[PDB]
Design an enzyme around this catalytic site. Structure first.
Site, short mmCIF file in Angstrom:
data_model
loop_
_atom_site.label_atom_id
_atom_site.label_comp_id
_atom_site.label_asym_id
_atom_site.label_seq_id
_atom_site.Cartn_x
_atom_site.Cartn_y
_atom_site.Cartn_z
N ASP A 306 0.80 -1.21 0.00
CA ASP A 306 0.00 0.00 0.00
C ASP A 306 0.84 1.27 0.00
O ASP A 306 1.95 1.31 0.54
CB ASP A 306 -0.90 0.03 1.23
CG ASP A 306 -0.10 0.08 2.52
OD1 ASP A 306 0.75 -0.82 2.71
OD2 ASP A 306 -0.31 1.01 3.33
N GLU A 307 0.28 2.30 -0.62
CA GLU A 307 0.90 3.62 -0.66
C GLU A 307 2.40 3.68 -0.95
O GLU A 307 3.15 4.37 -0.25
CB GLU A 307 0.54 4.34 0.65
CG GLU A 307 -0.97 4.24 0.92
CD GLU A 307 -1.39 4.63 2.32
OE1 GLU A 307 -0.60 4.46 3.27
OE2 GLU A 307 -2.55 5.08 2.47
C1 LIG Z 1 -3.40 0.21 3.80
C2 LIG Z 1 -3.52 1.44 4.69
O1 LIG Z 1 -4.55 1.63 5.33
N1 LIG Z 1 -2.48 2.27 4.74
C3 LIG Z 1 -2.53 3.44 5.61
C4 LIG Z 1 -2.05 3.05 7.02
O2 LIG Z 1 -0.63 2.92 7.04
C5 LIG Z 1 -2.48 4.09 8.06
O3 LIG Z 1 -2.12 3.67 9.37
C6 LIG Z 1 -3.99 4.22 7.94
C7 LIG Z 1 -4.63 5.08 9.01
O4 LIG Z 1 -6.03 5.14 8.83
O5 LIG Z 1 -4.29 4.83 6.68
C8 LIG Z 1 -3.97 4.00 5.56
O6 LIG Z 1 -4.12 4.75 4.42
#
Ligand SMILES: CC(=O)N[C@@H]1[C@@H](O)[C@H](O)[C@@H](CO)O[C@H]1O
Ligand SMILES: [Cl-]
Ligand SMILES: [Cl-]
Ligand SMILES: [Cl-]
Length: 499
Positions: A306-307
């Site tokens: 992710d990201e």
């Molecule tokens: C797959 C994913 O969820 N990645 C991030 C995560 O690292 C973060 O802790 C979270 C908080 O809501 O937000 C998401 O975008």
């Protein structure tokens, strides 16, 4: 009489909603002389001792566990239409009998029993009771095989005992998988022998600075053992190629410019990346996955994905094409966030969808297509099951990037027809992730996890036919006295008619 009701709680008043509930006759009453009769096997006794430990404090009863005689509470392993996780619970003056094909089924039966008993069962000192169990029969089996909860121990580290505590919180609702986010930008939480500094340096801090922490091999093994005793298969995650600052800060050579970035203590995401054009990058990945797989008796290994916004699309695709095989090489099944769906998931892989209602059609399409191609889907929408998301604009903890998520929104949906065009049979189940950018202690974890945690568990376990907000909220409201007696803080949502 909220704590010790005059009469027993309804046989159907439990979460997850059982597949079949048939109330009738008089209830069972646990008295000082009640014995817990189990089969003459280690696994049977194991569940018996677990049940005894749950009831001894509040009842003050001896509750011996034995493989002889006709105990008032019987746990028996026998053939039946209950699969690997289902069970049947019969209750009446003659006693309570929990029947299942396997220990996990008996364990799940116990989770139902603790809800049939009164709130006082949560106390640590002897209570008056009565210890009534509504009469009738319950036949229960799960809708989905993947029912997990994730704990982020990278943003804020939580030790073995705190993880065991969270494990006990989730075990209450029949979750069967524990996803552990072991690494991210703010920390690396698992000791890797081949790369010592990952833990000693990469684990030295966390969000907000100060001391961090990490699990030695022994501690990790203990968490896995404890999880297994609670029938939770541990799914470890080492996020890559993004969310890798902890590792990058530990070894300069892993960085594209050969310079180790500082340890990160902020709360943003998307700025880090392993250097895809370096060979050392894949020696690192192979070493880590190899050591992690050896500590993982479970079938899955989560590689995140992710990201990876500091990783050009082409490089991301190239990276995943190269690393996925490494997972199979060490005998495990790969799992990744849904971004992996855009990087050719290998056969047998599963992807975790964390999209939202508002997510663009193109993105939803790419995931639905992977499902059509055989990729299993784990549903955990950020605007549905992310337990770190605020309930409203006034919630004192959590985030709000995915908007606000009250109790009804978190519960009111159907995994089968959630993602447009996705084959229903491709949906393996659901997950409730709890990210910790804003949570630093066990009580804060509880406030954000409850009362939504039970709801997601129901989506993974209960039949679609039992899904209904108006009646579910009544069953959820009934948990209040239990949580209060257990010392479990929770958000008293105005959408729930709390008992
Ligand atoms: C797959 C994913 O969820 N990645 C991030 C995560 O690292 C973060 O802790 C979270 C908080 O809501 O937000 C998401 O975008
Ligand atoms: Cl608990
Ligand atoms: Cl920052
Ligand atoms: Cl951000």
């Amino acid at each position: 009489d909220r704590k010790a009701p005059v009469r027993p709680t309804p046989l159907d008043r439990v979460i997850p909603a059982p597949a079949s509930v048939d109330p009738g006759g008089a209830p069972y009453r646990i008295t000082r002389g009640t014995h817990i009769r189990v089969d003459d096997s280690r696994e049977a006794r194991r569940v018996g001792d677990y049940l005894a430990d749950l009831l001894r404090p509040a009842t003050g009863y001896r509750l011996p566990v034995t493989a002889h005689g006709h105990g008032g509470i019987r746990l028996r392993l026998a053939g039946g239409p209950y699969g690997d996780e289902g069970y049947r619970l019969d209750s009446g003056p003659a006693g309570v009998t929990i029947t299942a094909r396997k220990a996990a089924g008996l364990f799940h039966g116990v989770q139902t029993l603790r809800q049939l008993l009164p709130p006082a069962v949560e106390k640590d000192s002897a209570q008056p009771g009565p210890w009534l169990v509504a009469g009738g029969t319950i036949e229960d089996t799960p809708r989905y095989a993947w029912r997990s909860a994730m704990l982020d121990v990278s943003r804020h580290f939580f030790g073995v005992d705190e993880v065991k505590r969270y494990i006990d919180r989730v075990a209450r609702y029949k979750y069967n998988k524990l996803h552990l986010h072991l690494s991210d930008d703010q920390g690396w939480r698992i000791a890797i022998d081949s790369w010592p500094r990952l833990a000693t340096y990469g684990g030295s801090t966390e969000v907000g600075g100060g001391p961090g922490g990490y699990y030695t091999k022994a501690e990790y093994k203990e968490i896995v053992r404890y999880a297994a005793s609670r029938h939770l298969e541990v799914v470890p995650e080492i996020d890559m190629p993004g969310h890798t600052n902890a590792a990058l800060a530990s070894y300069a050579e892993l960085n594209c410019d050969g310079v180790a970035p500082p340890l990160y203590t902020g709360t943003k995401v998307g700025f880090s990346s392993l250097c895809v054009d370096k060979d050392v990058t894949y020696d690192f990945v192979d070493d880590v996955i190899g050591e992690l797989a050896a500590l993982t008796p479970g079938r899955y290994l989560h590689i995140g994905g992710d990201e990876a916004h500091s990783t050009p699309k082409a490089d991301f695709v190239a990276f995943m094409k190269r690393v996925q095989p490494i997972v199979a090489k060490y005998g495990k099944t790969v799992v990744g966030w849904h971004q992996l769906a855009g990087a050719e998931p290998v056969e047998g892989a599963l992807v975790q969808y964390w999209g939202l209602d508002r997510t663009g059609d193109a993105e939803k399409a790419e995931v639905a297509e992977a499902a059509r191609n055989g990729t299993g889907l784990i549903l955990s929408p950020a605007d549905r099951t992310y337990l770190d998301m605020k309930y409203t604009k006034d919630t004192p903890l959590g985030l709000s990037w995915a908007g606000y998520v009250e109790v009804q929104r978190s519960y009111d949906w159907d995994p089968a027809g959630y993602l447009p065009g996705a084959p229903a049979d491709a949906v393996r189940g659901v997950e409730a992730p709890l990210w910790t950018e804003t949570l630093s202690d066990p009580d804060q974890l509880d406030y954000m996890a409850f009362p939504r945690l039970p709801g997601v568990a129901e989506l993974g376990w209960s039949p679609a036919s039992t899904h209904d907000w108006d009646t579910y909220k009544v069953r959820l409201a009934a948990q209040a006295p239990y949580w209060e007696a257990a010392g479990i803080d929770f958000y008293r949502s105005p959408q729930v008619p709390w008992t």
